[PDB]
Design a protein that fits this description.
Elements lengths: L1 E4 L5 H15 L4 E4 L6 H9 L5 E5 H8 L10 H16 L2 E9 L2 E6 H7 L15 E4 L10 H8 L5 E4 L5 H6 L6 E4 L4 H4 L2 E3 L11 E6 L1 H4 L2 H7 L8 H12 L5 H11 L5
Parallel strand pairs: 1-2, 6-7
Antiparallel strand pairs: 3-10, 4-10, 5-8, 5-9
Helix pairs in contact: 1-12, 3-4
The structure holds tetramethylammonium ion (TMA), chloride ion (CL) and zinc ion (3 copies).
């Protein structure tokens, strides 16, 4: 049977989607990875109407963006997971099949040398400078309720200008001073490579983004399919994902091969 895997447009989405495809294919499915749908909302819409059967979402995204729930006073990872799992099920029959084992958080990043000069270590240190800085969003952060609107509300500042670009372009854009602040993805080692500095989210504005495989309700009836997805439960930690991402973004290796190498190493395929 046919299984189409969605993806948002960045490294680990391609890698994980392919990882899932290989495991499904090893268990009798014809799996494909669909690319270029767009972001969170379009992937979730696609999942609901069965254009895709499953994709890799993050808890904090599902909570704030998809379910449009209100930030608690404190972010608690397992609480957000529990509420996402219940809310997706209650709303659309969407099933959280598996936790992959890693967070890929939004984290605000600046150039390290600028941060060092200005004594900027945490997001509230940006307040002094924010109305002079250019923000380089990925396609979603600028407009998402847990993105800049959350930075605005919790820290009380907006940036001078907001540019949007594909996720992968953020890192060079800030390195080359086209922008000054980016919502870096914490599974992307180009933060270190390009000499950027993640700022502490000292007021806890941003939620946890635990990577989860979500499946639409009709597909989740397939228990064998579900059980294949669960082979990945907790199997991919942040350093593993960062390493696999590096292989994609810096080594320019194919997403399927990166996935296959990982699965072979882990004894998940022989
Ligand atoms: C994956 N992102 C970053 C939320
Ligand atoms: Cl996301
Ligand atoms: Zn000012
Ligand atoms: Zn590890
Ligand atoms: Zn072998």
């Amino acid at each position: 049977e046919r299984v189409v895997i969605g993806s948002k447009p960045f490294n680990e989405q391609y890698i994980l989607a392919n990882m899932i495809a290989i495991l499904l294919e090893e268990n009798g499915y014809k799996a494909e990875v669909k690319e270029g749908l767009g972001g969170t909302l379009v992937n979730y819409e696609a999942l609901k109407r069965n254009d895709i059967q499953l994709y890799v979402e993050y808890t904090g995204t599902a909570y704030n963006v998809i379910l449009r729930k209100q930030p608690p006073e404190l972010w608690d990872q397992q609480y957000i997971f529990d509420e996402v799992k219940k809310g997706l099920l209650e709303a659309d029959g969407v099933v959280v099949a598996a936790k992959l084992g890693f967070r890929d958080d939004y984290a605000l990043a600046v150039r390290a040398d600028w941060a060092e000069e200005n004594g900027v270590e945490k997001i509230s240190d940006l307040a002094e400078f924010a109305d002079q800085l250019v923000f380089g969003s990925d396609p979603e952060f600028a407009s998402r309720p847990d993105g800049l609107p959350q930075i605005k509300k919790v820290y009380g500042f907006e940036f001078k200008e907001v540019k949007q670009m594909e996720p992968t372009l953020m890192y060079e854009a800030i390195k080359n001073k086209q922008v000054d602040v980016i919502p870096a993805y914490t599974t992307d080692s180009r933060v270190d490579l390009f000499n950027l500095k993640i700022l502490e989210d000292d007021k806890g504005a941003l939620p946890p983004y635990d990577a989860i495989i979500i499946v639409n309700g009709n597909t989740a009836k397939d228990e064998k399919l579900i059980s294949v997805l669960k082979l990945l439960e907790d199997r991919i930690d942040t350093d593993t994902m960062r390493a696999l991402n590096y292989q994609y973004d810096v080594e320019k290796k194919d997403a399927r091969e990166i996935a296959m190498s990982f699965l072979k190493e882990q004894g998940l395929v022989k």
